[PDB]
Amino acid sequence: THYTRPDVAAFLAFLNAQEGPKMEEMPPAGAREMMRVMGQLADVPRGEIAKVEDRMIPGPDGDIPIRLYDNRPDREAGPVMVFYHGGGWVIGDLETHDPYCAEAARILDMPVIAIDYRLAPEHPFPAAPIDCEAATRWVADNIACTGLVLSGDSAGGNLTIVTALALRDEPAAKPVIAIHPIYPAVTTHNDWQSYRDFGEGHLLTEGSMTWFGNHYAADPADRRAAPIDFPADGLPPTLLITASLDPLRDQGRAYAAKLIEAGVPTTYREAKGTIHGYICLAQGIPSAKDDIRGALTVLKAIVAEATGA
Amino acid sequence: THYTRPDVAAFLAFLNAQEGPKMEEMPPAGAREMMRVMGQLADVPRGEIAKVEDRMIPGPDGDIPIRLYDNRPDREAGPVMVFYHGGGWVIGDLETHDPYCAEAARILDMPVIAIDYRLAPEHPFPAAPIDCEAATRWVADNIACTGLVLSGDSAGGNLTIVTALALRDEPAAKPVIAIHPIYPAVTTHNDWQSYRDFGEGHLLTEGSMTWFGNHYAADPADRRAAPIDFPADGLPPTLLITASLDPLRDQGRAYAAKLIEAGVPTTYREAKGTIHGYICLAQGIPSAKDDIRGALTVLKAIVAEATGA
């Protein structure tokens, strides 16, 4: 068997008992609704936060909606985090990841901008990376900041890495000073021991990954889909976290190892005994709160080191 | 050309203009004196520290001299750092690394115990790793502490990793909670691009390394000489730092990568634009002070997270 935290095993037993269709049997609209209802039941609320503002920004295929979270709006010019939500490029929105964004804004003490990027299958690859890169450049130009911290979970961890590579090659008005990919997808291939071990029973399944991947319809040769296939030299200091029961664990490790081999300062964290998707499950999995807090404390120090030097 | 900090360049200009024999042209006694005099000229002094105590402990072969540094001797039982000096298993002692150990004890706010292990060629491999393991067990059994933090530079980085692998397999009376190998040697072979790039003009030279290697006479197939060839699973949280102009940089990268691939939580830092040996050169290379302080701040947080269990 595999080490599993007791509260994770308890939440898994709950997930395994639910009646009614799997996500992969649903059209996108119904999958999108499943995730909202799961968040309502198993995520914490937003909690208290001084400022949350929505607006539209111009992007190349139309307006991109963003949400700015700031718990200390009187700050001076400092770093800003841009956040790209997960949901396999099909599901997720500004509300599914709202409680995480707010928590991040509170712990990091920096403004957090979440991007509502275009989703498949209505907008297949490469709409998501186009939107994310355009939003991030807009932020560097238009928001008072000294530097960008890019972060995202799962599909959004992918978008974090691909966006950091596009800005490494052609810089924004402000540098990326750090990146925080959370349980990222970095490749489209499934030849991984963690994929054989954990591809059933652990929230993210073989069935649901196939479903995501077919709708997004990514070009597997393109760096925007498969950044483990391309040089990593000159990326900023990276905090990469994986979850030990996650079918994507091993490609996360492999990416972190590639970063170290290219000389990129890297902090690898593994949430031991927990599953993919934990950053939105902090009420159903209470130990998730310490994983969130523990990673963002390390990130806060990484950013403080980059700004003090 | 390779990025080089201006103050490192300036130190190297001075070192390369020195007259008088190279270390490798000397018998061990004369090499040992060169290192003491280099430290005298290019290291910071011990500075203020509440307590420094010298004693002998019983070892497998006789007395092992140790030195205890504590900047807060009143403390409650907490973590203790055991430190293994570098010098290619031939040179170095308690005085060569004294200013670093005091600095660590101040920044980490924990006791630091430096070990004077047996040196080659009078005592070839495996004397040093046996002594280090024996002293570390003595500390766990005899000094009030809750856990051990092992650290060391170069040969001493090797001894840190080897010692942690020995205690992973048969634990001391107290757990290892973190390890901090500083520009470690993890193999005896030289097939590394960094070795071809930086094996002359950067303080640690091909000639030095061969001279150390011949005196130590390590068995290249033994885990105690070549830890990179053996499983890393189940080591504690590791902070591994390399210097970018070091002949040993690439094997250090490769070890940090292997730790990540085994699921060990790992922070990799690279001192960009600096050389091997910088922890003893903080007066001749003033930027070394921020490399020391930067790493020890990270380690201190790693330990704080472990002891909040």
Author numbering:
A (entry chain B), B (entry chain A): 6 to 314
From the reporting publication:
SpL is a hormone-sensitive lipase-like (HSL-like) protein adopting the alpha-beta hydrolase fold, with a helical lid domain over the active site cavity with the catalytic triad. The common Ser-His-Asp catalytic triad was located at positions Ser159, His281, and Asp251. Mutational and structural studies revealed that an aspartate next to the catalytically active serine is highly beneficial for the observed activity, which has not been described before, showing that a catalytic tetrad is actually required (Asp-Ser-His-Asp) for SpL for efficient amide formation in aqueous buffer.
To gain insights into the mechanism of amide formation catalyzed by lipase SpL, its structure was determined by X-ray crystallography. Furthermore, two funnel-shaped channels leading from the surface to the catalytic triad or actually the tetrad were identified. The aspartate next to the catalytically active serine may represent an extension of the classical triad Ser-His-Asp/Glu42−44 in the lipase mechanism to a tetrad. Furthermore, the crystal structure showed that the enzyme possesses two access tunnels to the active site, probably one for the ester and one for the amine, another feature not described before. This feature allows for bringing together two sterically demanding substrates, the ester and amine, without interfering with each other.
